[PDB]
Amino acid sequence: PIMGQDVKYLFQSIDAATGSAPLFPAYQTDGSVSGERELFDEQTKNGRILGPGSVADSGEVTYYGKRGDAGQKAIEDAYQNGKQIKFWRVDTVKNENDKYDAQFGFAYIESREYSDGVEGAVEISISLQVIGELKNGEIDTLPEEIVNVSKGGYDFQQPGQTTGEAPGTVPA
Amino acid sequence: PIMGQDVKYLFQSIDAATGSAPLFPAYQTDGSVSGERELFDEQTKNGRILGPGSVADSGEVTYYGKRGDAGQKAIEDAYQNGKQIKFWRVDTVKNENDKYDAQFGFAYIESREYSDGVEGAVEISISLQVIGELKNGEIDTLPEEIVNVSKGGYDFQQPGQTTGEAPGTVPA
Amino acid sequence: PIMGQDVKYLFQSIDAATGSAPLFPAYQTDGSVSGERELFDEQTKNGRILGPGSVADSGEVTYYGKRGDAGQKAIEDAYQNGKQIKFWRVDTVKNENDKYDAQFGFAYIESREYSDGVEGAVEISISLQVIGELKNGEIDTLPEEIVNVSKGGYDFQQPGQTTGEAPGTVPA
Amino acid sequence: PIMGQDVKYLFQSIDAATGSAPLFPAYQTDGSVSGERELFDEQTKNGRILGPGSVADSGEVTYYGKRGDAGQKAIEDAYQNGKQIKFWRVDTVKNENDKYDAQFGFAYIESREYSDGVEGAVEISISLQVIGELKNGEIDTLPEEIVNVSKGGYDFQQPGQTTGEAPGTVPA
Amino acid sequence: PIMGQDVKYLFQSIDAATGSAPLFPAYQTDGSVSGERELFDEQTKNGRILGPGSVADSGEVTYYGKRGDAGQKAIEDAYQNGKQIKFWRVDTVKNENDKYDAQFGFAYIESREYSDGVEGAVEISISLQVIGELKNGEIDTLPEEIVNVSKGGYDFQQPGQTTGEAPGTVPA
Amino acid sequence: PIMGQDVKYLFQSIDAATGSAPLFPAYQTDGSVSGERELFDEQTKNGRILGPGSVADSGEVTYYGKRGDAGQKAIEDAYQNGKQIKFWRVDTVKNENDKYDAQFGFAYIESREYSDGVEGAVEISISLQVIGELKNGEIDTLPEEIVNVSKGGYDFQQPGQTTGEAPGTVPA
Amino acid sequence: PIMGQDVKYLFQSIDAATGSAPLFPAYQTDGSVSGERELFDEQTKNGRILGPGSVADSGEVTYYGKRGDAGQKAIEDAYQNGKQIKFWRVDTVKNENDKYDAQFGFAYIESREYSDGVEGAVEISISLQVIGELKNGEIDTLPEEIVNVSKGGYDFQQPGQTTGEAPGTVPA
Amino acid sequence: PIMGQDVKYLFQSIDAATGSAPLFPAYQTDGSVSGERELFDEQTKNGRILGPGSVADSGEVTYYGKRGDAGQKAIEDAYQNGKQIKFWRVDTVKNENDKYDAQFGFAYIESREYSDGVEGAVEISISLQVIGELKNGEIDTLPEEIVNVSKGGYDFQQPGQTTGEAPGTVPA
Amino acid sequence: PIMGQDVKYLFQSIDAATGSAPLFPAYQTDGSVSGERELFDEQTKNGRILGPGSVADSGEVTYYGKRGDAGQKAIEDAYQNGKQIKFWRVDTVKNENDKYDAQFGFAYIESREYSDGVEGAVEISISLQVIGELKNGEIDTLPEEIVNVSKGGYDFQQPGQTTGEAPGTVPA
Amino acid sequence: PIMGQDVKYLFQSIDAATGSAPLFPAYQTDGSVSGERELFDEQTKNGRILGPGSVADSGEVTYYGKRGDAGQKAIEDAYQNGKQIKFWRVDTVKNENDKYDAQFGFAYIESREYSDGVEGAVEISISLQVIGELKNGEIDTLPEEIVNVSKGGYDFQQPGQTTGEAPGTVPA
Amino acid sequence: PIMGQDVKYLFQSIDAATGSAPLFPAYQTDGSVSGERELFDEQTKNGRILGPGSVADSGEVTYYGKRGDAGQKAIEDAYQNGKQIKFWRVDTVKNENDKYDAQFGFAYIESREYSDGVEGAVEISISLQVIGELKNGEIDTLPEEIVNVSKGGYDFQQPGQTTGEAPGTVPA
Provide, as residue numbers in chain E, all residues whose Cβ is less than 8 Å from the Cβ of D5: 44-45
Strand partners, C134: C104
Provide, as residue numbers in chain J, all residues whose Cβ is less than 8 Å from the Cβ of A162: 17
Q: Does K108 touch chain I (CB under 8 A)?
A: yes
Note the resolution in Å, 1 decimal.
4.0
In single-letter form, the type of residue at position H126 comes to I
- Asked if residue B90 lies in contact with residue B22, where contact means CB atoms within 8 angstroms, the answer is no
d(CA G75, CA I24): 49
Q: Does K40 touch chain J (CB under 8 A)?
A: yes
User: Residue K53's Cα: distance from chain center in Å?
Assistant: 26
CA atoms within 13 A on the CB side of J118: 9
Q: Which residues contact B93 (CB under 8 A, 6 or more apart)?
A: B2, B6, B100, C67
The nearest alpha carbon in chain C to E78 belongs to: C164
Interchain CB distance below 8 Å, D2 and G66: yes
d(CA E85, CA B138): 34
- Asked if residue F53 lies in contact with residue F132, where contact means CB atoms within 8 angstroms, the answer is no
Count other C-beta atoms under 10 Å from residue J151's C-beta: 7
d(CA C169, CA C163): 6
- Asked if residue A98 lies in contact with residue A138, where contact means CB atoms within 8 angstroms, the answer is yes
d(CA I61, CA I84): 15
Would you put residue H18 in left (φ > 0), alpha (ψ -120 to 50) or beta?
Answer: beta
User: Residue C168's Cα: distance from chain center in Å?
Assistant: 28
Is the sign of the CA dihedral D155, D159, D165, D169 positive or negative?
Answer: negative
- Asked if residue C69 lies in contact with residue C21, where contact means CB atoms within 8 angstroms, the answer is no
Angle, CA C171 vertex, CA C166 and CA C172 arms, to 5°: 90
Name the phi and psi angles at K74, rounded to 5: -75, -30
d(CA D26, CA D124): 11
- Asked if residue C67 lies in contact with residue C25, where contact means CB atoms within 8 angstroms, the answer is no
d(CA A90, CA A143): 12
- Asked if residue C137 lies in contact with residue C94, where contact means CB atoms within 8 angstroms, the answer is no
d(CA H6, CA F54): 51
3-state secondary structure of B88: strand
Report the structure determination method.
cryo-EM
d(CA E53, CA C164): 26
Q: Which residues contact F45 (CB under 8 A, 6 or more apart)?
A: G5, G25, G26, G27, G149, G152
CA Rg, chain I, in Å? 21
A·I CB contacts under 8 A: 4
d(CA H15, CA H12): 9
Provide, as residue numbers in chain A, all residues whose Cβ is less than 8 Å from the Cβ of K54: 119
Provide, as residue numbers in chain I, all residues whose Cβ is less than 8 Å from the Cβ of A118: 42-44
3-state secondary structure of B90: strand
In single-letter form, the type of residue at position D125 comes to S
Helix %, strand %, coil % for chain I, to 5?
5, 30, 60
- Asked if residue A112 lies in contact with residue H57, where contact means CB atoms within 8 angstroms, the answer is no
- Asked if residue B33 lies in contact with residue B58, where contact means CB atoms within 8 angstroms, the answer is yes
d(CA J86, CA A168): 11
- Nearest alpha carbon to residue G59 among G75, G48, G44: G75
Q: What is the DSSP string of chain J?
A: ---TTSEE--EEETTT--TT----SSB----EEEEEEEE---TTSS--TTEEEEEEEEEEEEE---SS-THHHHHHIIIIII--EEEEEEE-SPPSSSS--EEEEEEEEEEEEEE--SSSPPEEEEEEEES--B----S---SSSSSS-S-SS----TTT---SSS------
3-state secondary structure of E55: strand
d(CA B7, CA A165): 52
The nearest alpha carbon in chain B to A135 belongs to: B80
Angle, CA G45 vertex, CA G40 and CA G51 arms, to 5°: 30
Do at least 3 CB pairs under 8 Å connect G with H?
Answer: yes
Provide, as residue numbers in chain G, all residues whose Cβ is less than 8 Å from the Cβ of H87: none
Mutate to test the interface with B, among C14, C63, C116 (most CBs of B within 10 A): C116
F neighbours by CB contacts (3+ pairs under 8 Å): D, E, G, H, I
Q: Does D49 touch chain C (CB under 8 A)?
A: no
Distances, alpha carbon G119 to alpha carbons D63, D64, D147, E43, G61, in Å: 14, 16, 19, 9, 22
Provide, as residue numbers in chain B, all residues whose Cβ is less than 8 Å from the Cβ of C129: 38, 49
J neighbours by CB contacts (3+ pairs under 8 Å): A, B, C, K
Helix (H), strand (E) at residue G115? strand G102-115
b/e string for F128-139 if b means 16 or more Cβ within 10 A? bbbbbbbebebe
Interchain CB distance below 8 Å, A119 and I44: no
**Burial status of residue J16 (CB atoms within 10 A of its CB: 0-12, 13-18, 19 or more):** middle
Give a three-class secondary structure readout of chain F.
CCCCCCEECCEEECCCCCCCCCCCCCECCCCEEEEECCECCCCCCCCCCCECCCEEEEEEEEECCCCCCCHHHHHHHHHHHHCCEEEEEEECCCCCCCCCCEEEEEEEEEEEEEECCCCCCCEEEEEEEECCCECCCCCCCCCCCCCCCCCCCCCCCCCCCCCCCCCCCCCC
d(CA J169, CA J152): 14
Strand partners, J7: J91
d(CA E79, CA A107): 54
d(CA D16, CA D70): 12
Kindly give the pairing relationship between strand B85-91 and strand C102-115.
unpaired
Q: Does K150 touch chain A (CB under 8 A)?
A: no
Kindly give the pairing relationship between strand B123-130 and strand A85-91.
unpaired
Strand partners, J34: J57
In single-letter form, the type of residue at position G86 comes to K
Q: Which residues contact H13 (CB under 8 A, 6 or more apart)?
A: H22, H74, H77, H78, H83, H85, H86
- Nearest alpha carbon to residue I84 among I75, I73, I96: I75
b/e string for I115-132 if b means 16 or more Cβ within 10 A? bbbeeebbbbbbbbbbbb
Q: Does E43 touch chain G (CB under 8 A)?
A: yes
In single-letter form, the type of residue at position G10 comes to L
Do at least 3 CB pairs under 8 Å connect H with A?
Answer: yes
Q: Does J43 touch chain C (CB under 8 A)?
A: yes
Strand partners, E12: E86
- Nearest alpha carbon to residue A50 among B38, B21, B85, C79: B85
Interchain CB distance below 8 Å, H2 and A65: yes
In chain C, breaks (C-N over 2.5 A) are found after none
d(CA G2, CA H72): 13
Q: Which residues contact A13 (CB under 8 A, 6 or more apart)?
A: A74, A77, A78, A83, A85, A86
CA atoms within 13 A on the CB side of J157: 14
3-state secondary structure of I77: helix
In single-letter form, the type of residue at position J11 comes to F
Q: What is the DSSP string of K121-146?
A: PPEEEEEEEES--B----S---SSSS
d(CA H27, CA H33): 18
Torsion of CA G157, G161, G164, G167, to 10 degrees: -50
3-state secondary structure of H140: coil
Q: What is the DSSP string of B28-64?
A: ----EEEEE------TTTT--TT----EEEEEEEEE-
Q: Does D153 touch chain F (CB under 8 A)?
A: yes
- Nearest alpha carbon to residue J92 among J10, J22, J6: J6
d(CA J3, CA B153): 38
Provide, as residue numbers in chain D, all residues whose Cβ is less than 8 Å from the Cβ of F105: 153
What is the DSSP-derived secondary structure letter of residue K81? Answer: I
Quote the longest CA-to-CA distance of chain E.
85
What is the DSSP-derived secondary structure letter of residue E39? Answer: B
Q: Which of K28, K47, K135 sits opposite J80 (nearest CB)?
A: K135
G·I CB contacts under 8 A: 52
d(CA G85, CA C172): 85
Q: Does I20 touch chain G (CB under 8 A)?
A: yes
d(CA A5, CA J53): 10
CA atoms within 13 A on the CB side of G24: 24
Q: Which of E37, E45, E48 sits opposite D119 (nearest CB)?
A: E37
- Asked if residue B104 lies in contact with residue B88, where contact means CB atoms within 8 angstroms, the answer is yes
Count other C-beta atoms under 10 Å from residue K97's C-beta: 7
- Nearest alpha carbon to residue I26 among I149, I109, I166: I149
Name the phi and psi angles at K114, rounded to 5: -115, 145
Q: Does J64 touch chain K (CB under 8 A)?
A: yes
Strand partners, G27: G63
Helix (H), strand (E) at residue D71? helix D71-76
d(CA A130, CA A9): 14
Q: Does J44 touch chain C (CB under 8 A)?
A: yes
Interchain CB distance below 8 Å, F44 and H118: yes
- Asked if residue C90 lies in contact with residue C102, where contact means CB atoms within 8 angstroms, the answer is yes
Q: Does H119 touch chain K (CB under 8 A)?
A: no
Distances, alpha carbon K138 to alpha carbons A59, K134, K146, in Å: 60, 12, 15
User: Residue C82's Cα: distance from chain center in Å?
Assistant: 19
Count other C-beta atoms under 10 Å from residue A58's C-beta: 16
3-state secondary structure of G35: strand
Strand partners, E128: E59, E109
Helix (H), strand (E) at residue D74? helix D71-76
CA atoms within 13 A on the CB side of I29: 11
Angle, CA G160 vertex, CA G158 and CA G163 arms, to 5°: 95
Name the phi and psi angles at D153, rounded to 5: -80, 145
Rounded to a whole number, what is the distance in Å from the CA of J37 to chain B's nearest CA?
9
Strand partners, I86: I12, I106
The nearest alpha carbon in chain F to G120 belongs to: F39
d(CA K59, CA K62): 9
What is the DSSP-derived secondary structure letter of residue A128? Answer: E
Q: Does G93 touch chain F (CB under 8 A)?
A: no
**Burial status of residue H146 (CB atoms within 10 A of its CB: 0-12, 13-18, 19 or more):** middle
Is the sign of the CA dihedral G101, G105, G108, G110 positive or negative?
Answer: negative
Mutate to test the interface with I, among H5, H62, H90, H123 (most CBs of I within 10 A): H5
Q: Which residues contact I69 (CB under 8 A, 6 or more apart)?
A: I22, I24, I25
Interchain CB distance below 8 Å, K45 and A8: no
